[PDB]
Design a protein around this ligand. Structure first.
Ligand SMILES: Nc1ncnc2c1ncn2[C@@H]1O[C@H](COP(=O)(O)O)[C@@H](O)[C@H]1O
Ligand SMILES: Nc1ncnc2c1ncn2[C@@H]1O[C@H](COP(=O)(O)O)[C@@H](O)[C@H]1O
Ligand SMILES: NC(=O)c1cccnc1
Ligand SMILES: NC(=O)c1cccnc1
Ligand SMILES: NC(=O)c1cccnc1
Ligand SMILES: NC(=O)c1cccnc1
Lengths: 189, 204, 204, 189
């Protein structure tokens, strides 16, 4: 999914060997196989390492936590809110375009007790999310953050973003987001 | 993924807590969410148990093999060697599901994937050098005539596999599949998609 | 052969007086008498009408072609040339039945019947030089990957063919088969027999 | 179905190029394809010609005659009762071994009004016979003659018998029936 070229490597120095060029190619390949970008996921260096080269996996703990899921965000401004004291990495998250019917939206804010009831009505099954995703407001850096049920989360293809992080700003600077990626990043649900 | 109730388990006598009625529910639920069935996969009890509750985790031809015809998958639904305890007992058939959106990367050839020219023919449809990525290729099995499908590992690790309601016979390990032993309701829900035999033309 | 009631007829809009319910009855009746389903056959309205009410009447490869996968037979369920009146309109799919006792003469190869070595390979299973007599051979279609079956004329003229409940689309002549358009109840009754891939060993 | 060798030809002189040898081979082939011998059918020369080289076909007339069928008989003694004034031929009739479940037997004699009701009970549908066959007594040269519904009749494979006919005896002489064929000719139903 990386395309070709060198070895993508996360560093505080910056994601090694990753160009918006590479981005456009690996995005086009995914689009040709039915995948659609649903937002960003900001995390720290070795966690980025794991996800990209190992895949999104759940944690054999807390199996029944009601709001368990993999969080992402439409605007990297919000995603950017996540990274290590010492500098993280931003990733773009893809799902097959077919699962989009299972993405719901609510105005209540997620992971709060009064949203549980409403969210189960949308999802049509008691939580936690299974192959669903739910978006509701409650970001800060912007409203709107999305939770992916882990079964969906683990079947997404994840790749580095071209938006970089700064060891001085640990919010997000507009000027740093490549305009080519600005284009790639429109949203479905 | 597996519906309403009891905890499913793989036994030489049958899959515990699975019934066709439960399969119908599981299937509807997966369809309701964008999944389409593309075949059966046959294995031994242990591989079955973990794939179903651990998922499909992973050479030019490296991939995961499935089969649209349960009869072909049923030939692998057994221990092929005595195991730890010296047994060779039946296995189970699993049903494999992938997103409907992925269907454009499923091709079909009349070459046996062994045929000298298979590779370039497969790369020609796939559109990139081998291994299969989020692709799949269905062709006849050499020496048999039946069609076997190989999913590329990237695609395979992203499937949803649930148990089949078709039982393997323990009083007949190695046996052929009695067609009458397939539940009509399972037969009814197992049509397959039309794979492309010509290369991938770019989406809209 | 075709069940209870009305007189069946082939129309561009559909087969008149055929319903899945009627197909279930016809099928049960044929099964009750030793017939087993081995495939679909697609043609134009006129050939359809007469085969169904006149029977299958008749080179190394001379035979009657059928297909287990309705999608493949559906590609021939149309006029391939304008006809007398300059039309090219849809056709019909028929379901072909043969006696269960004849199944021992049904073989399977991974060679395309076109392949240079197909002939001897086919004669090797069949057990006599070509043409197929009361035999049949199923192999991949060249250029496609799907399996096509050829019954030998002697066998073919002794089949029982009834209408399928799968409609061909008149607003889409040449179209591919929407899988959803197959009645589940027809899908449910269309499993196929296991053909031999090894030569005929003599009966008891 | 003739095997190989020359050209089988019916003649008052006798069936040209047909040996019990040929018979055994063409019988073994049929047996290897699931066919089973159900009796004989005696008819005249050009009718034998038609059936063997053209196939058993019905006649587009009398479509609803209640007792319509193709008659055969277990013993050629009875079948022998049929041939032209001027000399016929005997044929052996084969059906797939799977249709045998649809062969019924009654004690009443067929093609008589009191058998209609009973026969429909056996056959399980109003006459005429469809893919059924019904055997009942009423031969003379022996009892027992069998009627084949035409749909079954037309899907039988028919071949010459080795028992010949005599232009002096137009009954059947025991001595004339080859003992090899005597063996081939056991009966199912
Ligand atoms: N391989 C992984 N798959 C998914 N999330 C992971 C993984 N490795 C690191 N992470 C991070 O772990 C958090 C997810 O774990 P959980 O605490 O169960 O939500 C997020 O911060 C992820 O960025
Ligand atoms: N090709 C034919 N198929 C069946 N029976 C025929 C045929 N040609 C001659 N026959 C004779 O015709 C009688 C059958 O015709 P039907 O009068 O309708 O019973 C029998 O004597 C048959 O021997
Ligand atoms: N960890 C993240 O990137 C994230 C993004 C949005 C909402 N919650 C968490
Ligand atoms: N294990 C299987 O079901 C199988 C099917 C087709 C080819 N190879 C293996
Ligand atoms: N007419 C048909 O259905 C057909 C099927 C397979 C091969 N050739 C023709
Ligand atoms: N025509 C015949 O050979 C025949 C044989 C037995 C009973 N009725 C007719």
């Amino acid at each position: 999914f990386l395309g070709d070229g060198g070895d993508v490597s996360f560093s505080t120095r910056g994601t090694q060997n990753w160009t918006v060029e590479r981005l456009l190619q690996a995005h086009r390949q995914l689009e040709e196989r039915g995948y659609v970008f649903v937002g960003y996921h900001g995390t720290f260096l070795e966690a980025a390492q794991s996800i990209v080269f190992g895949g999104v996996r759940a944690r054999s703990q807390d199996l029944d936590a009601i709001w368990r899921g993999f969080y992402i965000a439409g605007d990297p401004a919000l995603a950017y809110g996540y990274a290590q004291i010492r500098n993280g990495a931003l990733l773009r998250v893809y799902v097959p375009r077919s699962s989009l019917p299972g993405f719901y939206r609510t105005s209540l804010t997620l992971a709060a007790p009064e949203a549980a009831g409403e969210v189960e009505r949308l999802i049509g099954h008691p939580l936690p999310l299974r192959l669903d995703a739910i978006t509701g407001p409650e970001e800060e850096g912007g409203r709107l953050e999305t939770i992916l049920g882990w079964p969906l989360a683990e079947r997404t293809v994840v790749i580095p973003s071209a938006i970089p992080t700064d060891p001085r700003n640990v919010d997000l600077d507009p000027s740093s987001i490549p305009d080519k990626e600005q284009a790639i990043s429109a949203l479905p649900d």
